[PDB]
């Protein structure tokens, strides 16, 4: 595949999410850009249905791993770009310890020159006064590492990894992630040896933005 050639320079990104957590419905729209040569993502997300009913940090992993920096000698293990432009499906189960869980299904693909991530999310079994629906998580985010493995029978990849969310009382909220990715097209894709993606994260706010929102900077680097 020549999918990697689609990512030179700085590529525009559109993210669309529709969610339902314990019957609280919401939508999020995000826009920004990705620089895969440097593994750098910059995006701003808005809640288009008023107040987001969950904490912004809990949606970071759901809201484009094709922008990871794969070093030149690991180029043969970059499944995510190889599936482009037709793209891939990305599915997760995210289990919050002592609380509920998210189920997500997304399609990541090019629409013209824009890389688009379109997601449906359903949240189940949350406590109304827990850390999520009670908005008890700090507005920040930790660095993390995720182990990527091949799923040869599905012509895709899978991953299990942990995310830790700081809580306002000084405790930590664990979010266990299960992930599977499968290509949308029927063309050839790259199936990788096992390796790591390393993510660095910085969350902020736009001082002139009245809407409920999240500004995100990310660096993502492959290093098996």
From TrEMBL:
List, alphabetically, the Gene3D superfamilies matched: Green fluorescent protein
Q: Which lineage do the record's taxonomy fields give for this organism?
A: Eukaryota, Metazoa, Cnidaria, Hydrozoa, Hydroidolina
Q: Which keywords describe this protein according to UniProt?
A: Chromophore, Luminescence, Photoprotein
Q: Name one Pfam family in it.
A: GFP
The keyword Transit peptide is assigned to this record? no
Q: One biological process GO term for this chain?
A: generation of precursor metabolites and energy
Q: Does the keyword Thylakoid apply?
A: no
Per its record, how is this protein called by name?
Green fluorescent protein
Family named by the database record: Belongs to the GFP family.
Gene name for this UniProt entry: gfp
